[PDB]
């Protein structure tokens, strides 16, 4: 359908314990496909999906060069942020960055992204026009002034409109057997007595890809948003995801409740009931 590519980066300083830890991962949609961890023995960017393994040694050398340069830039930027926030050198701090693109079904750029965070909070973000910035505070405004003088936004725009979408389309094509395959959820409803008076109906969705999914419980056709414990969608570990939604119902009233499941892999939404 529509698709996304994202690179995530985290640097965590650890004073007294060497240089900051740097970890970056790349995703297409909900599929992890590259990783780099600075604490690996002799760190290189490594494949995590079979369709990226075919890229040649020049690809991995350039990726690794980039990962190492980003780690070094982050190390200096962590020291800079100490100055910007008048912070001590003794504490651990976090710098995060995400960037990437979304493409539509025709393969055209839908939206580009580039945003940074310090200690878990927004720092500076490229706006959706890919031409202007949103700085979160007076510290990030210093960065914004530097990046305006350097026309950083124009340079990110050229990458996001160009290489980002062109490589995402290449990956979608090379990994089409998995990236362009939706696995619908395997679903069932389970029943768990809570007492003589009521029982849990739990609606399960297992083995599905991508992660986007909607599970809703209805009683005689009306949503039970109030009463629904919905867990966060969670990885199975084999590329697929799991989710369940649960409602507590009066015993004997189970046939009034239906679970509605929408997912890209299904022909049409499912309607499930408890079947003893």
């Amino acid at each position: 359908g529509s698709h996304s590519m994202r690179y995530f980066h985290t640097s965590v300083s650890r004073p007294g314990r060497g240089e900051p830890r740097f970890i970056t991962v790349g995703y297409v949609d909900d599929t992890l496909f590259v990783r780099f961890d600075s604490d690996a023995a002799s760190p290189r960017e490594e494949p995590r999906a079979p369709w990226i393994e075919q890229e040649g040694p020049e690809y991995w050398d350039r990726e690794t060069q980039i990962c190492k340069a980003k780690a070094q830039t982050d190390r200096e930027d962590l020291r800079t942020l100490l100055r910007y926030y008048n912070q001590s050198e003794a504490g651990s701090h976090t710098l995060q960055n995400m960037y990437g693109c979304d493409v539509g079904p025709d393969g055209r750029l839908l939206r580009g992204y580039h945003q940074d965070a310090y200690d878990g909070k927004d720092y500076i973000a490229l706006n959706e026009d890919l031409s202007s910035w949103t700085a979160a505070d007076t510290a990030a405004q210093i960065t914004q002034r530097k990046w305006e003088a350097a026309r950083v936004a124009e340079q990110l725009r050229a990458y996001l409109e160009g290489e980002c979408v062109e490589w995402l389309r290449r990956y979608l094509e090379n990994g089409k057997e998995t990236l362009q395959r939706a696995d619908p959820p395997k679903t069932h409803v389970t029943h768990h007595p809570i007492s003589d008076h009521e029982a849990t109906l739990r609606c399960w969705a297992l083995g599905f890809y991508p992660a986007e999914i909607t599970l809703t419980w209805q009683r005689d056709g009306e949503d039970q948003t109030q009463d629904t414990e919905l867990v966060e969608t969670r990885p199975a570990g084999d590329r697929t995801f799991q989710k369940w939604a649960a409602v507590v119902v009066p015993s004997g009233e189970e046939q009034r409740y239906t679970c509605h499941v929408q997912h890209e892999g299904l022909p049409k939404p499912l309607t499930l009931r408890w079947e003893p």
Partner: peptide, 9 residues
């Protein structure tokens, strides 16, 4: 693939 350019805070 990743972008080549980055800029200090």
């Amino acid at each position: 693939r990743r972008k080549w350019r980055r800029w200090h805070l």
